[PDB]
Design a protein around this ligand. Structure first.
Ligand code: CLA
Ligand code: CLA
Ligand code: CLA
Ligand code: CLA
Ligand code: CLA
Ligand code: CLA
Ligand code: CLA
Ligand code: CLA
Ligand code: CLA
Ligand SMILES: CC1=C(C/C=C(\C)CCC[C@H](C)CCC[C@H](C)CCCC(C)C)C(=O)c2ccccc2C1=O
Ligand code: SF4
Ligand code: SF4
Lengths: 165, 73, 144, 61, 73, 39, 738, 80
């Protein structure tokens, strides 16, 4: 396939490693009863293992001679070959949630900064304020891009500054 | 494997260069010690006052960068 | 006030002797001696360690370095309003009033001390080290 | 100088409060070199919240 | 092969660390503001803060993610 | 009592609570959706 | 004239200052403005001597703090017992101990951590414990998990009672200073009541419960078959059957014909061949002896009748010509400062826990105890670490008192004063004796390794080439072996199979054997003694240079803890007694590590194994691979690291993971132990520029850690890493190979 | 002797003099401050650099600093 790989649903190392995991699982399980809670635990274990292998094979994952899967990171490659469900969507989801957290943090800091006891509001939190700012943190990308278009998020040259510059 | 060790190498490079360049540039004047340039390159410390001054020389910055260099290599 | 005169014959306090005692420094390059007088008789704390009793009235002691005299000075000054003064004793016994001198301790201002080692200027107004270069010894711009 | 309680902007390069703003406590009407007295609300690296300055070093902002 | 390679590597690492140290000393002693004023040299010290901050950030992210991935493995 | 409520709203307690919440959520998620890797 | 004194309602019960952080210090209570505020707040929460200066206040405080500590202990104990009741294979192990392994901690079937549920036998899965509660409980006589259950319930109730008592005796009816000062009453009360009646009731419980049921268990009757304790109590007939003395009640004891009670008050010595434990009748007799001894001791001092002694009078009565005023004033110093007491007590406590570890591995008292070599090793090394820490703390608080609350006036010509005088001679002497021992002992090892790697083992130091023999130790062992014939004619055996003698084994496993001593052991003992003297030197300097110094003559006023005195007079970093304790802790760690290594290798190599003769786990490589450093490294360490570095895919994967984590954090400590806060603050400042540019600078100012804070965090992390590494390694290795 | 240097911002609060353990300082009459006193360091040869003074002086940009120099019997303060 790509770069010299093959779908995990086809790699032989995949299957032989699976047989080895199961030779281990059987030749460990055969020491207990069938009704023992240990036994039922081992059974559920093997079952979950099978389900995992099924899902990985059905996902069309690539895995070379190692048999262990692999991931590809280029938008064009992953898209032209249907591999967006591995890196692209995850990175975008993380970026969204992280921007959310950062933005609500910035807003809390700013809101509590213009009050009569910044140290106190920083050591002890206003619950109503926290909740309001949390629920309003949603549209943070739009709010931020608007602030940029107004040129407000960046400050002019008035920062504390070392002697040379 | 090659991928991951490559990224570790890049990290080592970046952090060692960071330490070295900060030491190089803050040698003239720091916000804490605006007159550091009046002491030359090397001097042990500056007394425990002001909340302690352990190893503030650009010399000592290099002295700390060497560890990261060894780690990377 | 006048400069006092070290009377070498002063009753030394009640002390059993400790390790911080005599060295050959006195016979090599320099050494020191302090003096004072007590109001009553009393026990106190030897700076170099050990317990000693001040004698009611004048007392005399021996210290190698100077900060020890400083410290016992501070102690007597603080704890009983006492007022000592001391003397650098040179190799060839050239007595030198190390204490008193100005007649009044420098805690309170006194007309007569000439303002010394002073720069009627700020410290950000010093010059770059590039310019102080090329001297027979290494000078910091701070001096100029 | 400006009346007491006024707000000025410190500009002495060395000053820990450089390029910042503080409240003027008062100014000496006499001729001392630094009659300006400026409170602050963020202590420096030694725990002080009020510093003295000459006239020029500040800007009432 | 191994001896040659690693030896030359360590040599180069030491050399670069010393190069940075000496650049710092150049700043502390031979520098002048008047001549270098206004040009790229001055502009460096002008944006030193952003420089150091971005270096810190890149090093920090590399560290985080590379180590986390390794330990998940 | 209000003193007690403010003692609650002190910082370390709230940190513990928020982290407990996040961790419990992640655990229940990995329970009900075991071993996800894609999508 | 002594009585009870108390004061009412001293402090209310309210959350007011609960909403006021740092209320205890008028300094901190004015608010935070920089980061280090938080560090300080946590740091001096319990520094009662710096809080205020009322003896009675600090006293009530430490009393209720004691109660809190107690309640916590009861909680954790009840937790152990309840876990043992509900999630253990304890009854299976009771059925068969020799093949079922204790397991009480179980994991949850989640993302993959279920693989740890090791098959310990008994049709059970989980994790093997090492604490030995199983053997302890069998020794006591617990059969039904119902007993563990009710025990846990009672423990929880006791914890609640302790917390309530603390609250009460602090907030409602607080005592007074003289009632805290009635020391003769306190010693009489403790020594008589507590220990005497403890040993007495102990003897009682042993006799009437734990002796019979354990006789039965060792007889092999079915466990649940054995009758119940209250039945044993009620029916004198059963106990008469067991020991024909019981038929006669107590009249024979009353008639002073004590010999007849010898049926179950024995003096066997040696061990119990079926369990490897000591003879329970022997321990009962022991505890009776201790009981009467201490109860008689509890009748010494005078309290409200002229009979009895006066501690201060006795103290002063002992004065010497070479010493001047002798012991005068000590009764004062002790009746006045907590810190002197704390120093003395911690020192004794640490030494005692060490002795506990040694005695316990020497003469195993529990049934089936000698079997689990893992449990033996674990208990030993744990108690040893704890002893080392307690002793270092003793030193610390000693120096702290000396700085803070000493008074020169009260002690003019004191033993204390003259010691302070000739401190210089003392420290110099200790220095030299240390460096001498270091030289000889360690240079021996280096000389050995050089004679080996050079190719001339003819000239090494072993049992083969030029020899060194612990003649004294072999002599003492000989004599304690031959003692009972003449020294204790009514002793039926040596008190330890280590004095010499036969071999007792159980379940194909050795329980004890006479222990050899070689040139190896000589050299190891001497390394021990050297490092011990070095640690003692560090701490003794730390205390004798507390008030002042020939360098700093005003060390006293500067407090017990401070970074330096600036670069003055050549640089004054690390001059405080706090830093003394710092470095002393370092070297303590080193010494304890080495001693437990010695113990582990000796056991594994020359005592442990299984009977066929015996098959030592390393077959005895010790006495030839333990006198060279390369041999040490390879043959012991690099060897035994196997199971710990291949423990994957098994319930031992956790041990390897922790091995790695411990290496990591141990190395991580070094950044702290080496860096300098000025650089940190500069970088912080650049970061503040970054943040602030976005208008997100924090209202709490960022400040790098204080100098002493950096030092303390560094030492804590380093110690954690080292001890965690060795712990993980020990556990994995011994559980694998035993 | 280690170098010392006062500055016009010497407010004369004497905390320098109030700190030095070596009598390297003293207060003189002055004019530039309301206290009419400027610290004075006339006895450099006994300063050991302990920097207690630099720890004291509350001027925003310090007022009177210390600088390290060569050594001698007199200077380093070593009892032997
Ligand atoms: C900047 C670094 C970088 C690198 C090294 C790569 C690498 C690659 N990209 Mg590109 N790509 C990148 C970032 C990068 N991309 C990003 C962030 C995007 C999102 C817009 C894309 C979007 C993209 C698409 C849509 C496609 C590629 C393709 C490729 C592959 C062939 C082209 C090539 O040699 O590109 C070398 C590196 C560059 C050209 C750097 C500039 C990258 C910009 C952002 C996109 C350029 C796309 C390119 C013209 C497509 C050619 C076909 C190769 C795996 C093609 C592919 O999958 O071929 C099999 C393809 O169709 N990329
Ligand atoms: C509301 C939360 C918040 C936000 C929005 C920011 C914003 C910023 N932080 Mg972070 N930061 C915060 C709180 C926050 N920080 C706190 C509480 C800490 C722990 C002390 C730090 C410590 C910190 C450091 C040390 C650094 C950042 C950096 C940054 C920058 C990019 C974001 C990042 O990687 O982080 C930016 C100045 C990095 C930076 O400067 O990137 C350019 C950087 O080096 N931050
Ligand atoms: C061509 C090579 C070269 C040369 C000519 C010098 C020359 C010098 N170095 Mg060295 N130095 C070099 C490479 C070199 N260095 C390298 C590779 C290192 C890494 C170890 C350093 C790191 C270094 C430091 C950190 C310092 C010097 C210093 C010095 C000065 C005193 C040396 C004794 C002198 C000007 C000292 C100096 O100039 O102090 C002001 C000084 O502090 N050097
Ligand atoms: C920081 C790097 C990192 C990243 C990106 C991931 C990513 C992932 N981990 Mg996590 N994980 C990590 C470190 C990381 N893990 C660490 C340090 C631990 C130990 C505390 C774990 C332990 C762990 C487990 C036990 C599992 C995951 C799983 C997952 C998935 C969570 C969705 C995903 C593949 C789950 C999964 O299904 O992975 C495929 C899973 O089984 N992780
Ligand atoms: C001594 C301290 C201690 C510690 C370290 C633990 C630790 C644990 N307990 Mg808890 N537990 C303790 C005391 C303790 N317990 C006490 C005093 C009680 C009585 C109320 C319990 C009763 C208890 C139960 C009933 C359960 C736990 C469980 C657990 C586990 C998850 C929570 C964990 C191993 C859970 C567990 O192990 O599930 C398998 C669980 O179900 N514990
Ligand atoms: C002279 C010192 C001494 C000695 C050698 C022993 C020896 C022993 N005691 Mg201890 N014990 C002692 C004094 C001593 N005890 C005292 C003074 C008390 C009363 C406070 C106790 C109370 C006590 C109890 C309650 C128990 C032991 C137990 C033990 C065993 C633990 C080791 C061992 C048989 C345990 C035991 O005998 O288990 C079978 C046990 O449960 N001892
Ligand atoms: C210290 C705790 C203790 C307690 C609570 C009891 C309690 C009791 N003992 Mg005693 N007993 C004890 C220690 C104790 N004994 C010890 C240490 C000895 C040895 C001197 C004995 C030896 C002993 C005998 C020989 C007998 C009792 C008996 C009894 C019962 C009647 C009295 C009573 C339940 C009588 C009984 O009922 O025995 C079954 C009885 O005959 N005890
Ligand atoms: C018996 C237990 C005990 C108790 C009650 C205390 C009590 C105290 N210790 Mg600690 N301490 C102990 C054992 C104990 N310590 C041990 C075993 C060590 C060695 C690691 C130390 C080492 C130690 C140091 C080094 C310091 C304290 C400090 C303190 C005080 C503040 C916390 C407080 C009085 C701090 C303090 O304020 O001392 C005056 C402090 O600096 N302790
Ligand atoms: C500090 C302890 C110590 C002691 C007591 C000895 C003892 C001895 N050494 Mg020395 N040696 C030591 C450390 C020590 N060595 C170290 C650290 C290196 C060496 C290297 C060394 C050599 C190379 C030789 C000795 C020799 C000897 C022997 C006579 C001298 C004797 C066995 C000599 C000898 O007799 O060798 C057989 C000899 O040739 N040693
Ligand atoms: C690394 C290092 C620092 C820098 C490290 C610091 C300042 C500690 C940082 C502590 C944490 C990481 C930041 C504060 C954490 C608080 C809980 C605030 C909330 C943070 C949220 C993310 C929860 C020093 O200050 C220092 C001082 C003296 C000797 C050595 C060193 C040293 O080695
Ligand atoms: S900060 Fe460190 S180096 Fe500087 S004086 Fe203090 S202890 Fe010495
Ligand atoms: S320099 Fe500072 S401490 Fe010294 S007199 Fe002036 S104001 Fe006072």
């Amino acid at each position: 396939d790509i770069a010299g790989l093959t779908p995990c649903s086809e790699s032989k190392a995949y299957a032989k490693l699976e047989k080895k995991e199961l030779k281990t699982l059987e030749k460990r399980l055969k020491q207990y009863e069938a009704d023992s809670a240990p036994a039922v635990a081992l059974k559920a274990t093997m079952e979950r293992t099978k389900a995992r292998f099924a899902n990985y094979a059905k996902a069309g994952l690539l895995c070379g001679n190692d048999g262990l899967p692999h991931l590809i990171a280029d938008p064009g490659l992953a898209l032209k070959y249907g591999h967006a469900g591995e890196v692209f969507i995850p990175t975008f989801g993380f970026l969204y949630v992280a921007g959310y957290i950062g933005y609500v943090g910035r807003q809390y800091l700013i809101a509590v900064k213009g009050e009569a006891k910044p140290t106190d509001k920083e050591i002890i939190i206003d619950v109503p304020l926290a909740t309001k700012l949390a629920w309003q943190g949603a549209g943070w990308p739009l709010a931020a891009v608007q602030e940029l278009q107004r040129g407000t998020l960046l400050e002019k040259e008035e920062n504390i500054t070392v002697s040379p510059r | 494997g090659d991928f991951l060790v490559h990224h570790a190498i890049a990290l080592g490079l970046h952090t060692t260069t960071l330490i070295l360049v900060k030491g190089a540039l803050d040698a003239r004047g720091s916000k804490l010690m605006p007159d550091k340039k009046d002491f030359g390159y090397s001097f042990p410390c500056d007394g425990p006052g002001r909340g302690g001054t352990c190893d503030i020389s650009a010399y000592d910055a290099f002295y700390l960068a060497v560890f990261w260099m060894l780690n990377t290599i | 006030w006048t400069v006092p005169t070290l009377n070498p014959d002063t009753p030394s306090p009640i002390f059993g002797g400790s390790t911080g005692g005599l060295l050959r420094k006195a016979q090599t390059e320099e050494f020191y001696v302090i003096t004072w007088e007590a109001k009553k008789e009393q026990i106190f704390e030897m700076p170099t360690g050990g317990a000693a009793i001040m004698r009611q009235g004048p007392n005399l002691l021996k210290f190698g370095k100077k900060e020890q005299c400083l410290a016992l000075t501070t102690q007597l000054r603080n704890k009983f309003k006492l007022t000592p003064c001391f003397y650098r004793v040179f190799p060839d016994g050239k007595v030198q009033y190390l204490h008193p001198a100005d007649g009044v301790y420098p805690e309170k201002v006194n007309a007569g001390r000439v303002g010394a080692n002073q720069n009627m200027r700020r410290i950000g107004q010093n010059v770059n080290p590039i310019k102080v270069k090329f001297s027979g010894r290494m000078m910091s711009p701070a001096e100029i | 100088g400006p009346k007491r309680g006024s707000l000025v902007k410190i500009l002495r390069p060395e000053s820990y409060w450089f390029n910042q703003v503080g409240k003027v406590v008062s100014v000496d009407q006499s001729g001392v070199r630094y009659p300006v007295v400026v409170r602050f609300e963020n202590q420096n690296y030694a725990g002080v919240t009020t510093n003295n300055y000459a006239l020029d070093e500040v800007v009432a902002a | 092969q191994a001896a040659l390679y690693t030896h030359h590597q360590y040599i180069a690492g030491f050399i670069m660390c010393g190069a940075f140290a000496h650049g710092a000393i150049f700043f502390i002693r031979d520098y002048d503001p008047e001549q270098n004023k206004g040009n790229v040299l001055a502009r460096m010290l002008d944006h030193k803060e952003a420089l150091i901050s971005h270096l810190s950030w890149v090093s920090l992210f590399l560290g985080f993610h590379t180590l986390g991935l390794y330990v998940h493995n | 009592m209000k003193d007690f409520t403010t003692y609650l709203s002190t910082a370390p307690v709230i940190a513990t609570i928020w982290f407990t919440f996040t961790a419990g959520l992640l655990i229940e998620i990995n329970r009900y959706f075991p071993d996800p890797l894609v999508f | 004239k002594v009585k009870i004194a108390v004061d009412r309602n001293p402090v209310e019960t309210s959350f007011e200052k609960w909403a006021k952080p740092g209320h205890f210090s008028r300094t901190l209570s004015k608010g935070p403005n920089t980061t280090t505020w938080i560090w300080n707040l946590h740091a001096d929460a319990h520094d009662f001597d710096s809080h205020t200066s009322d003896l009675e206040e600090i006293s009530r405080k430490v009393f209720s703090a004691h109660f809190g500590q107690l309640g916590i202990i009861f909680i954790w104990l009840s937790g152990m017992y309840f876990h043992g009741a509900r999630f253990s294979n304890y009854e299976a192990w009771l059925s068969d101990p020799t093949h079922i392994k204790p397991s009480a901690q179980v994991v949850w079937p989640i993302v993959g951590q279920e693989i740890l549920n090791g098959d310990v036998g008994g049709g059970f899965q989980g994790i093997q414990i090492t604490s030995g509660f199983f053997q302890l409980w069998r020794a006591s006589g617990i059969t039904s998990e119902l007993q563990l259950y009710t025990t846990a319930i009672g423990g929880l109730v006791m914890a609640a009672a302790m917390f309530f008592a603390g609250w009460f005796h602090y907030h409602k009816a607080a005592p007074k200073l003289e009632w805290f000062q009635n020391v003769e009453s306190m010693l009489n009360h403790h020594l008589g009541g507590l220990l005497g009646l403890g040993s007495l009731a102990w003897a009682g419980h042993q006799i009437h419960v734990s002796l019979p049921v354990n006789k039965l268990l060792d007889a092999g009757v079915d466990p649940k078959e054995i009758p119940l304790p209250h039945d044993l109590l009620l029916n004198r007939a059963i106990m008469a059957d067991l020991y024909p003395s019981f038929a006669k009640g107590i009249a024979p004891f009353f008639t002073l014909n004590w010999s007849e009670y010898s049926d179950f008050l024995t003096f066997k010595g040696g061990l119990n061949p079926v369990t490897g434990g000591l003879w329970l009748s022997d321990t009962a007799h022991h505890h009776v002896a201790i009981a009467v001894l201490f109860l008689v001791a509890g009748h010494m001092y005078r309290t409200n009748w002229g009979i009895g002694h006066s501690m201060k009078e006795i103290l002063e009565a002992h004065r010497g010509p070479f010493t001047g005023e002798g012991h005068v004033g000590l009764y004062e110093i002790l009746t006045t400062s907590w810190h002197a007491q704390l120093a003395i007590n911690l020192a004794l406590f640490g030494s005692l826990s060490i002795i506990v570890a040694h005695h316990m591995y020497a003469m195993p008292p529990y049934p089936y105890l000698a079997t689990d070599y893992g449990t033996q090793l674990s208990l030993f090394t744990h108690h040893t670490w704890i002893g080392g820490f307690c002793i270092v703390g003793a030193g610390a608080h000693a120096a702290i008192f000396m700085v803070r609350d000493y008074d020169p006036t009260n002690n003019y010509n004191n033993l204390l004063d003259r010691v302070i005088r000739h401190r210089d001679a003392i420290i110099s002497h200790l220095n030299w004796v240390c460096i001498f021992l270091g030289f000889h002992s360690f240079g021996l090892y280096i000389h050995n390794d050089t004679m080996s790697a050079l190719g001339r083992p003819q000239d090494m130091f072993s049992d083969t080439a030029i020899q060194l023999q612990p003649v004294f130790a072999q002599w003492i062992q000989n004599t304690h072996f031959l003692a009972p014939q003449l020294t204790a004619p009514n002793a039926l055996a040596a008190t330890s199979l280590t004095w010499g003698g036969d071999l007792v084994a159980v379940g194909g496993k050795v329980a004890m054997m006479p222990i050899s001593l070689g040139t190896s052991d000589f050299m190891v003992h001497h390394i021990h003694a050297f490092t011990i003297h070095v640690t003692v030197l560090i701490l003794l300097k730390g205390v004798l240079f507390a008030r002042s110094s020939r360098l700093i003559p005003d060390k006293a006023n500067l407090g017990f803890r401070f970074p330096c005195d600036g670069p003055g007079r050549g640089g004054t970093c690390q001059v405080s007694a706090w830093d003394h304790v710092f470095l002393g802790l370092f070297w303590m760690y080193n010494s304890l590590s080495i001693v437990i290594f010695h113990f582990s290798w000796k056991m594994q190599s020359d005592v442990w194994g299984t009977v066929t003769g015996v098959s030592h786990i390393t077959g005895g490589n010790f006495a030839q691979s333990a006198n060279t450093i390369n041999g040490w490294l390879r043959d012991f360490l690099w060897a035994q690291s196997s199971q710990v570095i291949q423990s994957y895919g098994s319930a031992l994967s956790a041990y390897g993971l922790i091995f790695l984590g411990a290496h990591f954090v141990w190395a991580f400590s070094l950044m702290f132990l080496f860096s300098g806060r000025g650089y940190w603050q500069e970088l912080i400042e650049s970061i503040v520029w970054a943040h602030n540019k976005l208008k997100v600078a924090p209202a709490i100012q960022p400040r790098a850690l204080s100098i002493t804070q950096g030092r303390a965090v560094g030492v804590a992390h380093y110690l954690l890493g080292g001890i965690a590494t060795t712990w993980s390694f020990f556990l994995a290795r011994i559980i694998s190979v035993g | 002797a280690h170098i010392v240097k006062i500055y016009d911002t010497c407010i004369g609060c004497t905390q320098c003099v109030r700190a030095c353990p070596l009598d390297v300082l003293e207060m003189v009459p002055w004019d530039g401050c309301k206290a009419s006193q400027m610290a004075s360091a006339p006895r450099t040869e006994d300063c050991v650099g302990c920097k207690r003074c630099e720890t004291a002086c509350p001027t925003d940009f310090l007022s009177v600093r210390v600088y390290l120099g060569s050594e001698s019997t007199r200077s380093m303060g070593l009892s032997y």
